[PDB]
Amino acid sequence: MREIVHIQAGQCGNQIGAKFWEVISDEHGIDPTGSYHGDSDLQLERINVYYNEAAGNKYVPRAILVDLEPGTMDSVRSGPFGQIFRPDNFVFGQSGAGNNWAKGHYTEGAELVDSVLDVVRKESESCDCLQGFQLTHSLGGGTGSGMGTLLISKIREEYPDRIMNTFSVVPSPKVSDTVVEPYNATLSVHQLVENTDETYCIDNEALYDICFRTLKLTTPTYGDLNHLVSATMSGVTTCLRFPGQLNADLRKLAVNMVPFPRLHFFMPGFAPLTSRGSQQYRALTVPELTQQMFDAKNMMAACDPRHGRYLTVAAVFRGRMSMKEVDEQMLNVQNKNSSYFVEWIPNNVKTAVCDIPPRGLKMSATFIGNSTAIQELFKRISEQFTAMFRRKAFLHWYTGEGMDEMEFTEAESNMNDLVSEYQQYQ
Amino acid sequence: MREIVHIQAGQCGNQIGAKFWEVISDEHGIDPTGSYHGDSDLQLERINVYYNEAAGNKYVPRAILVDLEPGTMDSVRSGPFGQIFRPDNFVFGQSGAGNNWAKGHYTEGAELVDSVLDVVRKESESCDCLQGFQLTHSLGGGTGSGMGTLLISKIREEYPDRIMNTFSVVPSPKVSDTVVEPYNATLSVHQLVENTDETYCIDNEALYDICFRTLKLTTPTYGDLNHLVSATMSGVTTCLRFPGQLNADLRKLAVNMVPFPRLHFFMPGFAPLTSRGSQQYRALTVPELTQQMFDAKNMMAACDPRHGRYLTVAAVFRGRMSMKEVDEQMLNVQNKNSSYFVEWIPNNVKTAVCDIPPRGLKMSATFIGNSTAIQELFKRISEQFTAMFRRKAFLHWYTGEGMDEMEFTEAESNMNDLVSEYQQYQ
Amino acid sequence: MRECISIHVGQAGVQIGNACWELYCLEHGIQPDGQMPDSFNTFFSETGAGKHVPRAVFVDLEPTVIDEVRTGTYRQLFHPEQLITGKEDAANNYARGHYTIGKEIIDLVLDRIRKLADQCTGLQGFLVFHSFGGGTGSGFTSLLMERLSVDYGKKSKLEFSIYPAPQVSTAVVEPYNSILTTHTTLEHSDCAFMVDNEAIYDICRRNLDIERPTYTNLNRLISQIVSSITASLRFDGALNVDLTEFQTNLVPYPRIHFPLATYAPVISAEKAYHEQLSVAEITNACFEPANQMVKCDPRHGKYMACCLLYRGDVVPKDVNAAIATIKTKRSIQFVDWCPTGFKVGINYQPPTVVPGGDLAKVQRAVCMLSNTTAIAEAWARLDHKFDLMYAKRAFVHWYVGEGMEEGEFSEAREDMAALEKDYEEVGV
Amino acid sequence: MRECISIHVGQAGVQIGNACWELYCLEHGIQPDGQMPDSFNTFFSETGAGKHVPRAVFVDLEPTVIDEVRTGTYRQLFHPEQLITGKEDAANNYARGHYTIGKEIIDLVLDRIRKLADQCTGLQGFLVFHSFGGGTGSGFTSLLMERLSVDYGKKSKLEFSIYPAPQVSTAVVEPYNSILTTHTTLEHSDCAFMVDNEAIYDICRRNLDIERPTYTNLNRLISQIVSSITASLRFDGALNVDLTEFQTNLVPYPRIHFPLATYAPVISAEKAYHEQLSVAEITNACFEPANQMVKCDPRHGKYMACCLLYRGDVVPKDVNAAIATIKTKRSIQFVDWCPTGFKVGINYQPPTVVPGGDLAKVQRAVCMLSNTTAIAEAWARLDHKFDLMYAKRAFVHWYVGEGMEEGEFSEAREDMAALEKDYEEVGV
Ligand SMILES: Nc1nc2c(ncn2[C@@H]2O[C@H](COP(=O)(O)OP(=O)(O)OP(=O)(O)O)[C@@H](O)[C@H]2O)c(=O)[nH]1
Ligand SMILES: Nc1nc2c(ncn2[C@@H]2O[C@H](COP(=O)(O)OP(=O)(O)OP(=O)(O)O)[C@@H](O)[C@H]2O)c(=O)[nH]1
Numbered sequence A, B: 001m002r003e004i005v006h007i008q009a010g011q012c013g014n015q016i017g018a019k020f021w022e023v024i025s026d027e028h029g030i031d032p033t034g035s036y037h038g039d040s041d042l043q044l045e046r047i048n049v050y051y052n053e054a055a056g057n058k059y060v061p062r063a064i065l066v067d068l069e070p071g072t073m074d075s076v077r078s079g080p081f082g083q084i085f086r087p088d089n090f091v092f093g094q095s096g097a098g099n100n101w102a103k104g105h106y107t108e109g110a111e112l113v114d115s116v117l118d119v120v121r122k123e124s125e126s127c128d129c130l131q132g133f134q135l136t137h138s139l140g141g142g143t144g145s146g147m148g149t150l151l152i153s154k155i156r157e158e159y160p161d162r163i164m165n166t167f168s169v170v171p172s173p174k175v176s177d178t179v180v181e182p183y184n185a186t187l188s189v190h191q192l193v194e195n196t197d198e199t200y201c202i203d204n205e206a207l208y209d210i211c212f213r214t215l216k217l218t219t220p221t222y223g224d225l226n227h228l229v230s231a232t233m234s235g236v237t238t239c240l241r242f243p244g245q246l247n248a249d250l251r252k253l254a255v256n257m258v259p260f261p262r263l264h265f266f267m268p269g270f271a272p273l274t275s276r277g278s279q280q281y282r283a284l285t286v287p288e289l290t291q292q293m294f295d296a297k298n299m300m301a302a303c304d305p306r307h308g309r310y311l312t313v314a315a316v317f318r319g320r321m322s323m324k325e326v327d328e329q330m331l332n333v334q335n336k337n338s339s340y341f342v343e344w345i346p347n348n349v350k351t352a353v354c355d356i357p358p359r360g361l362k363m364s365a366t367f368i369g370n371s372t373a374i375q376e377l378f379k380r381i382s383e384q385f386t387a388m389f390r391r392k393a394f395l396h397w398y399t400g401e402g403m404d405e406m407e408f409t410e411a412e413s414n415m416n417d418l419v420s421e422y423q424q425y426q
Numbered sequence C, D: 001m002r003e004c005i006s007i008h009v010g011q012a013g014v015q016i017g018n019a020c021w022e023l024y025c026l027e028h029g030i031q032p033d034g035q036m037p038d039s040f041n042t043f044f045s046e047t048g049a050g051k052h053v054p055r056a057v058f059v060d061l062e063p064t065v066i067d068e069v070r071t072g073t074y075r076q077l078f079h080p081e082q083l084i085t086g087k088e089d090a091a092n093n094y095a096r097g098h099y100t101i102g103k104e105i106i107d108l109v110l111d112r113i114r115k116l117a118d119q120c121t122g123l124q125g126f127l128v129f130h131s132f133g134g135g136t137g138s139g140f141t142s143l144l145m146e147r148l149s150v151d152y153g154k155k156s157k158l159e160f161s162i163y164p165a166p167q168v169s170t171a172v173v174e175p176y177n178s179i180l181t182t183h184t185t186l187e188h189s190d191c192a193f194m195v196d197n198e199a200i201y202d203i204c205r206r207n208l209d210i211e212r213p214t215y216t217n218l219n220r221l222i223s224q225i226v227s228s229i230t231a232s233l234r235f236d237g238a239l240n241v242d243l244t245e246f247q248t249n250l251v252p253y254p255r256i257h258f259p260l261a262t263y264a265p266v267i268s269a270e271k272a273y274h275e276q277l278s279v280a281e282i283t284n285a286c287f288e289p290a291n292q293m294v295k296c297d298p299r300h301g302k303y304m305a306c307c308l309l310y311r312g313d314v315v316p317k318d319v320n321a322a323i324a325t326i327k328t329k330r331s332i333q334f335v336d337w338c339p340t341g342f343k344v345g346i347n348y349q350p351p352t353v354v355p356g357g358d359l360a361k362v363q364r365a366v367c368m369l370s371n372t373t374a375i376a377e378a379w380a381r382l383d384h385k386f387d388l389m390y391a392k393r394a395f396v397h398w399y400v401g402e403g404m405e406e407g408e409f410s411e412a413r414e415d416m417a418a419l420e421k422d423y424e425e426v427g428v
């Protein structure tokens, strides 16, 4: 009945995206050829939310893959599950963006964007009732950031009444993977505040921490990091794909969690997460899950939620569970940690429960926090950007692509405004 | 219904602690994997007092293991029963304290203490109704003494209404195992008088004597010594874990035995103790047990109870016994040895009986004496400390870690005060 | 899909190219005849059946050095028309290279380049290998650079340059040439990667235990760096960086386009066995001045941008940790206008090693491209050298003979003074 | 988990290190090639696969002694970069060691130490082996000590020192060197364990029935003591004592940091069979002056702190009993300000014995570290010796030649006078 259209932009976007797709396939019992080999009828009932049926009992992701370089695409196509994707849904350029937002948004991306838009339009027009769009990408690169952002805006123009979701991997506090990261991030944020309905702030640093401290992983891989993100994504759409006792889809969650339009930057979290050794030495009950959820060590954003206050929290539970227990525990946590919840929104917690747990587990949870602590992240980027601009450093790389200084200033202004707004509510 | 949280600090603390845990496991029919293989339903009814149920019919000690060195931890984990412990409950530093109280309390210990506190908090919050805490450690080292003491204080701040119990191995009269022992002991005592509810004074010298003279053990091991301590501990909590005719738990015992807040340093004792040869040549009756209990050779503190007076005695009996006999015998002993009991507390003896005897035996007893003779121990330490301070010997090792002379003086003052108080009552 | 054209200019360039191409062949399993019994396509075109040809042009104004290529082991590897030779050399004279001799062969070389480009579907750009000191490496290269910009423009151009040493130097006129080529190439080059022969010698002696390093050894060492730089294009990695990237991440102002290369670990089979070559350890090695490939004092300068290209058995987290540690270290200082100073590439393929080479086989390597105000010092000495000689007009007549004017020298001087000023000012 | 770095300075240091490392290898089953077919990790790093490398640095200002290491049986055991040699020795001259010759190599050795430390997760500290009398053992060691304190500071530093004998001595300037190194190292060392070659000779002759003990034998004997000291770190025991412990338990005032070593039982296979080597008997042996490793009169001094490290088949109770007995004995006197004078370690592993060694295999051993006012006597004789020679300014010119000033000698004298005064005053 309801449909979700998936977009992947740039290297990061593609790589997370592939993992996500794999996860989804596993969940719905679909193999790398597109054929359903599942058992439970529940797995197929709402398969149309993510998959088009392409005849011969074969299913294909409603997924669009975009990059200014073909290498990523090649890597994807050759990977496990590369064959399930529709060949015509890979839309690639030849040049690349060289970690330049300007190229992604105004130059190379501009040339290619039309084709992708057309593909998206086609996808929408086949599907009976699109709920909306989910875009996976980084804010630190050129493609995912500049071209992805462009795509968002164009999508919104066509479909202003549909929900626009992003899973954005943002620049970490400790270590930077690009020199121009603050610029790319900032510009992306500028467009995101105005054109998305919600943005899930994923931080690689946080993921690494989780892998090391919670998962006890000596040598985490980028794949492993991506897996967590994928899991979170899966958790977020579970009520669209399976039955439940209390169901909340993308719109319900959004309305519960966004009290003012601009404040839609979430810190996602996933629970439970245990080692191979520490699997034995804890019981699988709701309390444990709750504990895991409400903990700085389990947040996928590099921000301490105890340095701000939660405006809203959405908790999405999967498995056969006592609702009473959930209700009690959510209450109890709030009572305990009253100081970390804004006082003028009574009952800060929204709860949803889906009967189908993920594979291999008896019970799972996904957490979405809208915390005023996110401001810290914004502040750090903002300061950096200001510093860089003070010396006009690297600016000719962007102005050379047709961009004007004024745009930068505007972006800065928006960034500062957002943080001010966050502070006000805090 | 009621819960006990166990803490082990430093080498001594860990080593006694492990033994204790083993003993408890044996008693409750739990094997080194955490699974219950017992027979009697009584063994499992109150298993929650010491063990959390971690699903898959597996049980895990509510035990926190702390040390500034990892070697001890490694030794424990590799030992028999090392696998039953929750891996996340081992909290270890990298540096060590080098038998320096200052390091344990203010420097290295300070760095690590937060983590341990957090773990303890977590443990408490899972358990429905904590009775309180039992800490095993020495007063002569740096970790168990300095860090252990620190832990106590922090615990008390959080949980001021819960019972704080210590099993402290104290410096012997004959031979010293460290040069700075008097300092470490003294400082520990200073904190202990103000922050614990009761302290069981264990002396290695006394244990050795017991092993040689009573147990007829040619070559006692530290393990063997620890065993006795473990047994005593087990005896002390028996009424929480099993049924009985007359039951006394930690609070009941404390109120019976501590007439003034500062006078909470007990001389523990355990009966019966026989050789392999002398097992045949005595009958297992209450009188024998009583005799064993009221005897200087059977006390685990290096102090002659006949050099002071008993303020209070708590006797805890295990096995199927005639209460009348017990009552008579306790009366009779008091009548006989009137001069060793304070005259202004009529009926100096408190009695408790638990129906479940320890394994391999028909009948057992645990003795807790609050004797004014303990003052002797304090005096000996005090004199030594004063002598050392007269020459400012080793002081730079402590002052170098940020400690001030004033603290030492304060500690001395408290020590002297305690002994004066003891003398007054005598 | 996306392709890279290599240009080898003069003796030094040609010899470096020989090494590099050999290494490439070894890495992709291409025999010296062009046969192999598909990412290598970025560097090699395919002809007919079972033959692969480098996307390369070799140019020298004299025949001798290239004649060795055309008679040597890899004679069948290169197509004859892409090995271009004149008759008379530039005789360590920029003017002969740029004007008198160079203007006779430049058109031909441009045509070949154009033809190469015709076979490209996604041209990434050009890598030019040349010395600063030789008449062809300087004069011809500047001519070629300018021409490239007109024909192409927007495509990225990268230079690998044998920068002259402070003490050790072969030519007498080398300073003149270096200044002049710098002046003329400045506005035409996007990024130039300097290295120094002295530094490579020292590293060979100290780290590889080689008593007497030969030019071949140096060339081989250079080849490794080149491989590291281009591995992101020639293989698929975890997190990877193309040729278009560098210029944006390493050049904060257009004229300050001289980042420097450092490779780690460079160690023999003796010292390789007795070491755990971890990611942290290799990374740390790169920020200590004795291992770096240009003789210069980074301790006396500040870092502006740093790019780390890891290869082999490497995982992101440990790299991140290493970077954090480096940041923490007070003796490694970054300019205050650059809070994010690291660009990081990670590729799965370990460095492949040439049979009979000086280097041991390692699980991991790193190539750092670092941009530092310490280059100012290097520039200064060169300037000083120029100044002395020009004060007496020593050798000036030769240049004039070949059509150069004295005013050009003045202009060059002025431009270098400007450059040094710029370098100073960025620092503060 | 917790690791220990060994530094071997000069001939004596190097030779001792050779013994010690051999012993370690024997104990952990490490072959001379670094292979073994996990507590040993505190002393050995692990590289790649099936190779283990000592956490050690060997330093000498001349090549000859270390050249034997690099050509000998254990050439593959050590990594080449951790065996550091200059060209010219310190020629029994503190000044050459500390200034003229030492300042050329110190930076290099510091760098290596830093690199070693980089591979440590829980660095316990450093063990430095050196003579007081040699130019490198003195001058270089003092330089190195000072440097260590600046770089590290809070980490513990321990010295093993061949203290010069009263009658037997090799060098002529030995007193000068001993005083000067004492002066300069005093504020930088936490604890220094002296031993004496005369004493070891006598013990070898008397207790082991060896007519003609060689330096090798002495070294071997030393190695055992070292093993005893570090067994608490290299194995797991009943009741055990780390390197951080000693400094707190043996040093009552900062300058009085010279405890002395005694080992028991040291006996051949002849006299081992015809004896029940019980715990009491071995312990008692250690408090009789003929078995002690420094020539000196404890009967004429008082004990201030005593640390007993037992190894092998030993049970606490008997040790305790032995200690009690010792306390009871009127001829073994402890200062009145120290009622608790014993620190006790007990480790499960019996002493391992080198094939072809002088010592028989025993069930139990003990290493006592004792701090005694009797060291004052030793200091006094040395002082007297210094005084005589300086009265005539004998050899003083040599020191001056290498940059030392006469005033330094005076300062050194003054400091030693202070030290002896302090020693006296503690006694009363
Ligand atoms: N690294 C390296 N440097 C070289 C090599 N051959 C020459 N050089 C350096 O190149 C510079 C000399 O320039 P060449 O390339 O020989 O001269 P050319 O480019 O042929 O110019 P002309 O002969 O004057 O036309 C000096 O700095 C040499 O040290 C080589 O094989 N490897
Ligand atoms: N125990 C022991 N002592 C040694 C050994 N070799 C030398 N000594 C002692 O060390 C002192 C002489 O110092 P060396 O170590 O030979 O001199 P060095 O440190 O090399 O100093 P220079 O040669 O002067 O630079 C004398 O007291 C010797 O008795 C040895 O193998 N074992």
Ligand SMILES: Nc1nc2c(ncn2[C@@H]2O[C@H](COP(=O)(O)OP(=O)(O)O)[C@@H](O)[C@H]2O)c(=O)[nH]1
Binding pocket: A009, A010, A011, A012, A013, A015, A016, A097, A098, A099, A138, A140, A141, A142, A143, A144, A145, A169, A170, A171, A177, A178, A204, A222, A223, A225, A226, C238, C239
């Ligand atoms: N979580 C995650 N982040 C990635 C991955 N690959 C790259 N990144 C991040 O993406 C940023 C670089 O952008 P990238 O997507 O490679 O550039 P683009 O291809 O031009 O969009 C850096 O912040 C990297 O940390 C990945 O596989 N997973």
Ligand SMILES: Nc1nc2c(ncn2[C@@H]2O[C@H](COP(=O)(O)OP(=O)(O)O)[C@@H](O)[C@H]2O)c(=O)[nH]1
Binding pocket: B009, B010, B011, B012, B013, B015, B016, B097, B098, B099, B138, B140, B141, B142, B143, B144, B145, B169, B170, B171, B177, B178, B204, B222, B223, B225, B226, D238, D239, D240
């Ligand atoms: N009863 C008992 N006492 C011990 C044991 N190990 C050490 N001790 C005592 O503890 C003191 C030394 O403290 P230790 O625990 O080693 O120092 P820490 O590791 O810093 O706490 C001495 O008085 C020893 O006699 C043991 O296993 N059992």
Ligand SMILES: [Mg+2]
Binding pocket: C010, C011, C060, C062, C089, C134, C136
């Ligand atoms: Mg030439």
Ligand SMILES: [Mg+2]
Binding pocket: D010, D011, D062, D089, D134, D136
């Ligand atoms: Mg020597």
